[PDB]
Design a protein around this ligand. Structure first.
Ligand SMILES: [Li+]
Length: 138
């Protein structure tokens, strides 16, 4: 040890009607994501895919927690059970159940997202922040 047990390397929004790839490289500087955004068409169904390595010892109780913030005054949190993953060379990919982008004129515009990849022991495997913008059209 010192070497980290879990290395989170990517986030991908999985949506077949998105015209281009929607991906964050989580291995580098994380600050630049704060002023970027992914556009999603209102009401579209998508999933979030987290890519990650496990290095040393099995990790069980893994969990993906996402807080969604809207205009600094409204918050919604979802916590997803990820599973138990043995150490191994090859990357893993977790995908959430299907979610639906916010729908309605009043639901358009910007949302901030606080993502945390953690476990039963509250290890901060990676925390990060990114943004969605909900639009009428792609
Ligand atoms: Li938090």
């Amino acid at each position: 040890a010192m070497v980290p047990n879990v290395v989170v390397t990517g986030l991908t929004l999985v949506c077949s009607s998105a015209p281009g790839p929607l991906e964050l490289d989580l291995t580098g500087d994380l600050e630049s994501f704060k002023k970027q955004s992914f556009v999603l068409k209102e009401g579209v169904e998508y999933r979030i895919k987290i890519s990650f390595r496990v290095n040393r010892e099995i990790v069980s109780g893994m969990k993906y927690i996402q807080h969604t913030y809207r205009t600094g005054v409204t918050i919604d949190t979802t916590d997803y059970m990820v599973g138990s993953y043995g150490p191994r060379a090859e990357e893993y990919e977790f995908l959430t159940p299907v979610e639906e982008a916010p729908k309605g004129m009043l639901a358009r515009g910007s949302y901030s997202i606080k993502s945390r990849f953690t476990d039963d022991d509250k290890t901060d495997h990676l925390s990060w922040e990114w943004n969605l913008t909900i639009k009428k059209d792609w």
